[PDB]
Coordinates of C-alpha atoms (C1' of nucleotides) in Angstrom, one line a residue:
Chain A
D1 CA -20.6 10.6 -29.1
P2 CA -24.1 9.0 -29.6
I3 CA -24.5 8.5 -25.8
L4 CA -24.2 12.2 -25.0
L5 CA -26.4 13.4 -27.9
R6 CA -29.7 11.9 -26.8
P7 CA -32.8 13.4 -25.1
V8 CA -33.1 13.7 -21.3
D9 CA -35.9 11.2 -21.4
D10 CA -33.5 8.8 -23.1
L11 CA -32.3 6.8 -20.2
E12 CA -35.8 6.5 -18.7
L13 CA -35.3 7.8 -15.1
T14 CA -37.6 9.3 -12.5
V15 CA -40.1 12.0 -13.6
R16 CA -38.7 14.4 -11.0
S17 CA -35.3 13.9 -12.7
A18 CA -36.7 15.1 -16.1
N19 CA -38.6 17.9 -14.4
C20 CA -35.5 19.2 -12.7
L21 CA -33.6 18.8 -16.0
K22 CA -36.0 21.1 -17.8
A23 CA -35.9 23.4 -14.8
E24 CA -32.2 23.8 -15.1
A25 CA -32.5 23.8 -18.9
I26 CA -31.2 20.2 -19.1
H27 CA -32.6 18.7 -22.3
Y28 CA -29.6 16.9 -24.0
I29 CA -27.1 14.5 -22.5
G30 CA -24.2 16.5 -23.9
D31 CA -24.0 19.0 -21.1
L32 CA -25.9 16.7 -18.7
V33 CA -22.6 14.9 -18.6
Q34 CA -21.0 18.3 -18.2
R35 CA -22.6 18.8 -14.8
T36 CA -20.6 17.7 -11.7
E37 CA -22.0 16.8 -8.3
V38 CA -22.3 20.3 -6.9
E39 CA -23.6 21.9 -10.1
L40 CA -26.4 19.4 -10.3
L41 CA -27.0 19.5 -6.6
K42 CA -27.6 23.3 -6.5
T43 CA -31.0 22.8 -8.2
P44 CA -34.4 23.0 -6.6
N45 CA -36.3 19.8 -5.5
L46 CA -33.4 17.7 -6.9
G47 CA -31.7 16.3 -3.8
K48 CA -29.7 13.1 -3.3
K49 CA -32.2 10.8 -5.0
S50 CA -32.4 12.2 -8.5
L51 CA -28.8 13.1 -9.0
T52 CA -27.7 9.7 -7.6
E53 CA -30.0 7.9 -9.9
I54 CA -28.4 9.9 -12.7
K55 CA -25.1 8.6 -11.4
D56 CA -26.3 5.0 -11.3
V57 CA -27.9 5.0 -14.8
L58 CA -24.9 6.6 -16.5
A59 CA -22.6 4.2 -14.6
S60 CA -24.7 1.4 -16.1
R61 CA -23.9 3.2 -19.4
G62 CA -20.4 3.8 -18.0
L63 CA -20.0 7.5 -18.4
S64 CA -19.0 10.0 -15.7
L65 CA -19.9 13.4 -14.3
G66 CA -18.8 16.8 -15.6
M67 CA -17.3 15.9 -18.9
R68 CA -16.0 19.0 -20.7
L69 CA -17.7 19.5 -24.1
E70 CA -16.4 20.7 -27.4
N71 CA -18.0 20.1 -30.8
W72 CA -21.4 20.8 -29.3
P73 CA -23.6 20.9 -31.4
Chain B
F1 CA -53.9 -8.9 -24.5
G2 CA -53.9 -12.6 -25.3
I3 CA -50.3 -13.1 -24.4
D4 CA -49.3 -16.6 -23.2
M5 CA -52.9 -17.0 -21.9
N6 CA -56.5 -17.9 -22.8
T7 CA -59.1 -15.3 -23.8
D8 CA -58.1 -11.7 -23.3
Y9 CA -60.3 -10.2 -20.6
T10 CA -61.9 -6.7 -20.6
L11 CA -60.9 -4.1 -18.1
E12 CA -63.4 -5.2 -15.4
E13 CA -62.1 -8.8 -15.3
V14 CA -58.5 -7.5 -14.9
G15 CA -59.8 -5.3 -12.1
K16 CA -61.5 -8.2 -10.4
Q17 CA -58.3 -10.2 -10.6
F18 CA -56.5 -7.1 -9.2
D19 CA -59.4 -5.9 -6.9
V20 CA -59.1 -2.5 -8.5
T21 CA -61.4 -0.4 -10.7
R22 CA -61.0 -0.3 -14.4
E23 CA -59.5 3.2 -14.7
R24 CA -56.5 2.1 -12.6
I25 CA -56.1 -0.8 -15.0
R26 CA -56.1 1.6 -17.9
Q27 CA -53.6 3.9 -16.2
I28 CA -51.3 0.9 -15.4
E29 CA -51.4 -0.4 -19.0
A30 CA -50.8 3.0 -20.4
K31 CA -47.9 3.4 -18.0
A32 CA -46.4 0.1 -19.2
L33 CA -46.8 0.9 -22.9
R34 CA -45.1 4.3 -22.3
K35 CA -42.3 2.5 -20.6
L36 CA -42.0 0.1 -23.6
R37 CA -42.2 2.8 -26.2
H38 CA -38.7 4.1 -25.6
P39 CA -35.6 2.4 -27.0
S40 CA -33.8 -0.1 -24.7
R41 CA -37.3 -1.8 -24.6
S42 CA -38.4 -0.9 -28.2
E43 CA -35.4 -1.7 -30.4
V44 CA -36.0 -5.4 -30.4
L45 CA -39.7 -5.3 -30.8
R46 CA -39.5 -2.6 -33.5
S47 CA -37.3 -4.7 -35.7
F48 CA -40.3 -7.0 -36.1
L49 CA -42.0 -4.0 -37.9
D50 CA -40.9 -3.7 -41.5
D51 CA -43.1 -0.6 -41.8
Chain C
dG1 C1' -92.4 -21.6 -70.2
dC2 C1' -94.9 -17.1 -67.0
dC3 C1' -96.4 -15.2 -63.8
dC4 C1' -98.1 -15.3 -59.2
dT5 C1' -97.2 -16.1 -54.8
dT6 C1' -95.4 -17.1 -50.8
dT7 C1' -90.9 -17.3 -48.3
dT8 C1' -86.8 -16.6 -46.3
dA9 C1' -82.1 -14.9 -46.1
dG10 C1' -79.5 -11.2 -45.8
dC11 C1' -78.2 -6.3 -45.3
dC12 C1' -79.2 -2.0 -42.8
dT13 C1' -80.2 1.7 -39.8
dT14 C1' -81.9 2.5 -34.0
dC15 C1' -81.5 1.6 -29.8
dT16 C1' -79.6 -0.5 -25.7
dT17 C1' -75.7 -2.0 -23.7
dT18 C1' -70.3 -2.8 -22.5
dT19 C1' -66.4 -1.3 -22.7
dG20 C1' -63.2 1.8 -22.9
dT21 C1' -61.7 7.1 -22.4
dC22 C1' -60.8 11.4 -20.2
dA23 C1' -60.7 14.9 -16.5
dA24 C1' -60.0 15.6 -11.7
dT25 C1' -58.8 14.4 -6.3
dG26 C1' -57.5 12.4 -1.5
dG27 C1' -53.6 11.1 0.7
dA28 C1' -49.2 8.5 1.4
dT29 C1' -44.7 8.0 0.8
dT30 C1' -41.3 9.9 -0.5
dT31 C1' -37.7 13.1 -1.7
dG32 C1' -35.9 17.6 -0.7
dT33 C1' -34.3 20.8 2.3
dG34 C1' -33.5 23.8 6.3
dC35 C1' -31.5 23.0 11.0
Chain D
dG1 C1' -29.3 12.9 12.8
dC2 C1' -33.9 15.4 12.9
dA3 C1' -37.7 17.7 11.6
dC4 C1' -40.7 20.0 8.5
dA5 C1' -42.2 21.1 3.0
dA6 C1' -43.7 20.1 -1.4
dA7 C1' -43.6 16.3 -5.6
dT8 C1' -46.0 12.9 -6.7
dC9 C1' -47.9 7.3 -7.2
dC10 C1' -52.3 4.4 -5.9
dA11 C1' -56.7 4.5 -6.1
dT12 C1' -61.7 6.6 -6.6
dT13 C1' -65.8 9.4 -8.9
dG14 C1' -68.2 11.3 -12.6
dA15 C1' -69.1 12.2 -17.0
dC16 C1' -68.8 10.6 -21.3
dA17 C1' -67.8 8.5 -26.3
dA18 C1' -67.3 4.8 -29.1
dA19 C1' -67.6 -0.3 -30.3
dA20 C1' -71.0 -4.6 -30.0
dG21 C1' -75.1 -6.8 -29.9
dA22 C1' -79.9 -7.2 -30.3
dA23 C1' -83.4 -6.3 -33.1
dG24 C1' -87.2 -4.9 -36.9
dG25 C1' -87.8 -3.4 -41.7
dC26 C1' -86.9 -3.5 -46.2
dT27 C1' -84.9 -5.3 -50.3
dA28 C1' -84.5 -9.0 -52.5
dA29 C1' -83.1 -13.5 -54.1
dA30 C1' -85.5 -17.9 -54.4
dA31 C1' -88.3 -22.2 -53.9
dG32 C1' -92.7 -23.7 -55.7
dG33 C1' -97.0 -24.3 -58.0
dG34 C1' -100.6 -23.9 -61.5
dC35 C1' -105.3 -23.6 -66.9
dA36 C1' -104.5 -27.6 -71.5

DNA sequence: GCCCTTTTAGCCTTCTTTTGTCAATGGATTTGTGC
DNA sequence: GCACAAATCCATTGACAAAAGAAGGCTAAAAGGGCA
């Protein structure tokens, strides 16, 4: 789906968010929606704030956490 | 810029209106243009560009 | 008509400025994280 | 719930590079006149 196939700087969130995404190899939304609360939380310097803003932005776009990908690419 | 206003001022005039030095004004405007460059803020403006 | 001449308008490159551009730097909150 | 541990947003400071004016010289039209 077009929503999960955009860059990590697509939804325009905190710069710490993008830094942590590239620090856990997050560069596309396809597996960014694959990560659940714990998996995202494990990262360094990505506490409540960044992950919960991810939650809020995708909720404004409606999607959810940890969606299991096939047909990727 | 001249948006909904009279003569567009230089950086120093914007700073005197904001009591900040010109380089902060340049950083702020660059920040805003970066924010506007991405879609969700660019799709509507960009359709005005038939180029 | 014929040059001479005198003149003035306009471009045309230097120099002085004004304005923007780029790099670094406290230091303040803030967010993260261990307890 | 608390207490430290960087990440990082508001502002300088310097050093500078590129328009923008201001001007001073050259071309260079361009009035303008005067032997018949």
